Design an enzyme around this catalytic site. Sequence first.
Site, PDB file in Angstrom:
ATOM      1  N   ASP E  47      -0.822  10.234  10.507  1.00 26.54           N
ATOM      2  CA  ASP E  47      -0.788   8.201  10.547  1.00 26.54           C
ATOM      3  C   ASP E  47       1.065   8.795   9.823  1.00 26.54           C
ATOM      4  O   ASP E  47       1.603   8.159   9.051  1.00 26.54           O
ATOM      5  CB  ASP E  47      -1.771   7.383   9.899  1.00 26.54           C
ATOM      6  CG  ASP E  47      -1.303   5.608   9.862  1.00 26.54           C
ATOM      7  OD1 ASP E  47      -0.184   5.843  10.343  1.00 26.54           O
ATOM      8  OD2 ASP E  47      -1.609   5.255   9.024  1.00 26.54           O
ATOM      9  N   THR E  80       8.096   1.132   6.857  1.00 26.83           N
ATOM     10  CA  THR E  80       7.809   1.809   6.943  1.00 26.83           C
ATOM     11  C   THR E  80       8.651   3.311   7.213  1.00 26.83           C
ATOM     12  O   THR E  80       9.786   3.491   7.105  1.00 26.83           O
ATOM     13  CB  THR E  80       6.628   3.015   5.993  1.00 26.83           C
ATOM     14  OG1 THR E  80       5.602   3.593   7.441  1.00 26.83           O
ATOM     15  CG2 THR E  80       5.990   1.684   5.367  1.00 26.83           C
ATOM     16  N   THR E  81       7.938   3.361   8.633  1.00 23.64           N
ATOM     17  CA  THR E  81       9.439   4.663   9.843  1.00 23.64           C
ATOM     18  C   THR E  81      10.110   3.199  10.195  1.00 23.64           C
ATOM     19  O   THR E  81      11.747   3.966  10.266  1.00 23.64           O
ATOM     20  CB  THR E  81       8.061   4.747  10.693  1.00 23.64           C
ATOM     21  OG1 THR E  81       8.114   3.361  11.668  1.00 23.64           O
ATOM     22  CG2 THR E  81       7.324   5.487  10.764  1.00 23.64           C
ATOM     23  N   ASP E 381      -0.400  -5.206   2.733  1.00 20.69           N
ATOM     24  CA  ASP E 381       0.641  -5.624   4.103  1.00 20.69           C
ATOM     25  C   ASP E 381       0.906  -7.257   4.444  1.00 20.69           C
ATOM     26  O   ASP E 381       2.006  -7.559   4.327  1.00 20.69           O
ATOM     27  CB  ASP E 381       1.415  -4.869   4.894  1.00 20.69           C
ATOM     28  CG  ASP E 381       1.684  -3.129   4.611  1.00 20.69           C
ATOM     29  OD1 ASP E 381       1.811  -3.552   3.072  1.00 20.69           O
ATOM     30  OD2 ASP E 381       1.494  -2.640   5.583  1.00 20.69           O
TER      31      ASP E 381
END
Lengths: 65, 129, 201, 200, 513, 72
Positions: E47, E80-81, E381
């Site tokens: 992940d 995040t990525t 989130d």
Amino acid sequence: AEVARAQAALAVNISAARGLQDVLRTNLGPKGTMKMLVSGAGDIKLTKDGNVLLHEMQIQHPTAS
Amino acid sequence: NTKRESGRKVQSGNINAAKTIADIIRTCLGPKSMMKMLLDPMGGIVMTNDGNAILREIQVQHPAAKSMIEISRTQDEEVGDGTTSVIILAGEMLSVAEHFLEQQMHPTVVISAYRKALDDMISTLKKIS
Amino acid sequence: MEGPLSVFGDRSTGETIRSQNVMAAASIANIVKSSLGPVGLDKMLVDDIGDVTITNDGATILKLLEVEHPAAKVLCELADLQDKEVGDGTTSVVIIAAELLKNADELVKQKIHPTSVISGYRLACKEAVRYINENLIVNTDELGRDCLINAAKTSMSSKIIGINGDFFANMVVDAVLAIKYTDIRGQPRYPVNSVNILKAH
Amino acid sequence: EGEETFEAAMLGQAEEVVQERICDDELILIKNTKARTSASIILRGANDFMCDEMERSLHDALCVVKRVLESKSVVPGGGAVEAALSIYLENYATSMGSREQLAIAEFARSLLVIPNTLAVNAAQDSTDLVAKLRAFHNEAQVNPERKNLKWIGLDLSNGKPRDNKQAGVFEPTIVKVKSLKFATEAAITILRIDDLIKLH
Amino acid sequence: RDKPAQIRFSNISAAKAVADAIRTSLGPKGMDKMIQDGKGDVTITNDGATILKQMQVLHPAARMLVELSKAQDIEAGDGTTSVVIIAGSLLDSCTKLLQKGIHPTIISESFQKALEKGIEILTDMSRPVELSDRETLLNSATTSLNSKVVSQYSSLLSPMSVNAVMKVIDPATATSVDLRDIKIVKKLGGTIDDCELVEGLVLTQKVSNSGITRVEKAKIGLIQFCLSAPKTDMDNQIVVSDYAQMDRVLREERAYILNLVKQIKKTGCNVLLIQKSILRDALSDLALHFLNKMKIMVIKDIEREDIEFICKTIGTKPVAHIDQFTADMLGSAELAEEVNLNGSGKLLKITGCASPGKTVTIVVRGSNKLVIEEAERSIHDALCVIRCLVKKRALIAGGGAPEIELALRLTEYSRTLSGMESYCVRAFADAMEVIPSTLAENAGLNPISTVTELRNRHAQGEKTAGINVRKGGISNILEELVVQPLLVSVSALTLATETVRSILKIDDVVNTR
Amino acid sequence: AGFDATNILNKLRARHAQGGTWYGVDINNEDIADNFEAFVWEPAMVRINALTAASEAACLIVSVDETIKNPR
């Protein structure tokens, strides 16, 4: 580990003995001599008798036991 | 972990340790005997007709060298003798059987020949006993 | 573990570790293959040095092998988990997994959505799974001539230790009849070994 | 303590408590235990191992009677049951096409190593068994039916399909639905990592 | 010198090498990692989103990507990525421009141009959402929670996500309503459905037993002192060379504190926050029994944030020493409550506490830790994606897809600018499209199929439409049920944009003395 | 034609599990379809010809692990 078998183990035996034995053959009768013996102590010993030479030091082989 | 072990190599070392242990012991066997003389790593020589006395006192190895003393001791306790037989017998059967038969390439029919040979052996013994 | 010597930790990116994993799955699944089934040869396995074990059961072998590879790890623990389901299929679930993880992963790369290739191994499963219950085609103990009685005799006759299995055709159906315990959650399940069975020659 | 009084709540209720010694073997035999029907099968061996001998052959018969009671029907044991499923599911792949001919055929082809390696362990091996398996197994008969127009069974003490169709050496229907998911699992299991890194 | 030139390349060497394999993103793609660490530590890793922050890298140029990872998450909570993976897209153009001979400052400034032109288009495509109404709050929570751990428990967590921000919501739209006000308190016991959004100051304070500060008119205090006693605050004339000498001073210690905890009980304050500052060790281990004896919740050297939560949210200040009773600057709580769900768990709730229209507190509950986790991170989130809407509203797509839409449309800006940078922005413009290709990249063999078409397809779907990586297939990507708030990617754009020109702002690497 | 073998061919093998008639890749059209309808054509002769010459030298050298020579 490893081993020795057949006449290979035999050859080591019969050779070590007769390799040690004729060294002792230098001495017998009066016409023998007195074999110089120095063990780990450092003392010289001269003997035509077997027990001294035999039980002090030996060229180490399975036959020497 | 990634590991696998292949076929003959263990089987060989089995047959190897099987027959080699059988060699001197089977020549130590019989009215005309031989002697198995160990030489210790220390220099002490150990001469015994029983390699079970020799092998346990010397290097015992992962192959059947591990599995020969167990079945020797299995042969040691029960009746009390046959001590030298099993390792010369097990080293005897495995070699002649396997290779030719593993050259015929099969484990299974080899397994059965034992129980096959077991009864005839029982048979002609119990008969000619 | 092939690949570069500078970086490690299952990190090649690449197919190197991936091929390594189809190799890591292989050798582990390779061990099972010769142990596969009861006819699988009992494998003398040296746990330390004099510590040794003879095992033809994959799960029992899978207990012995400490897995640095996740391939090794995902095959072991799961057949170890299928062993904790029942234990029928321990040696089974191992072997096919060596191929399928190359089957599961490969085509997800080739896309056609990321999720598609995976259910294909689930659907064909369910396909087979639907096919599974459909099979009395061979081995019918859901019915039979004596059903469970001759199924005993037959399952005797399969493993049969003599010309017996006749008196032992009935004993096995006694095992479900002698145990009335009717196992919990509504199962009419009767443990076969919970019967008093007292061995006297 | 030996002076303690004793009451009847420890007394068994049955037609008779009768001690029967037969075959040099006496057991306390509680005849028709009344609370619940009970039965116990005393083995008779030629020796003690004979009782163990016959006992393990029961265990095939035992679980398989019990396991089909656990979940109904079965599979034919061994990879013969999947040996037919392969081309079933590769055709079930073939018409799907695209990816769905790929994965679905990749899944079915991977089935087939079990039975051979099963027979290999029995030294009935591979080319012999694939000759044995899906030559019997057909698309002409894909049907489980109830019967055999193909022998899709595999008996293993053997390595070969056999003639016993009640045999407990074929697996039940239970672990099969399980193990396939687990077989699908170990494959899909390793897919899962996202991105990649090295802790360094 | 050559060192100035090589190091930026050496930066582009180590840095760009990292940001790329940082895309398997989403997908069930690539074989799972057991990572033996740089110190030899075996770690099972999956992940990439967390594998981002997890990653231990060396060199300045590699760590700025972790720095880059840290940046987007805390900002939005989403993508995040998204901020990092595009640093792969950046250093694509950079080298080629340095290979084109373009100057670092121009390549630097090229980052700002595309950025302005980029925030242009992402807002141009993005479809506005109302961050007041419960609706897109639920929806942005939904898709986020649909990308979070619990899809099933996305339900009750959603109002607990929606009401949390709507507790702290600020008039219309603005960048505000942080997660610091939100105090997420893991409560052992209960379930994820039992997770409770509480309006007020809740503390993670866990003290002895129960019924302890469950009463009414139980104020929660902060004491920057602790209680007195001989061998606590007040003196001992007796010295201990002897166990008997040890007893009479402890007895006199216990007997005096017993009077003081009465004075805390009559304070109306049934939770003191006892200073971690240690006077003798301050509040005695003999005292903790006595404060708890009065049903007052104090655990030795109370957790410091609870002290600040009561300061921040409630407005509590220290009081005079309990010897003097209390100045009652202890904030106003007519209820402080220790709740045991299933008769278990320690949670200090301050109800009737002063709260400044904010510090909404979700109590994330469960009988397991995983249960609390699966809740806690998911609602987070959901809190964020709504905080995202509030901060910067509407929605774009998710999984990198709308960036290709920016990529197509930016090359048009790269058509208009007519500068060196028009090429530089252009060298970057389509470098954006690498993401969904590299998202789908890592899973397998016979490779090349979808990759160029992972780009080509969108341009075929032209300027509105493209492929949706989450559901598959081509459409307007911004809603497939694939979204992230417009904040997330424009938050992703500038950071990597920023950090890379620093590499160009590098003349040469150094090492401190 | 710029396509995958597998899918495009599994498409065909889908179409050949389904229509099965002329379906095949058409290169300069960059697609798959029934080819004889598509005008994609070859006279059936050389096929069998190739098919005859296909399995032949195949079944020959597969019988060759043994090749013999002289230097002299």
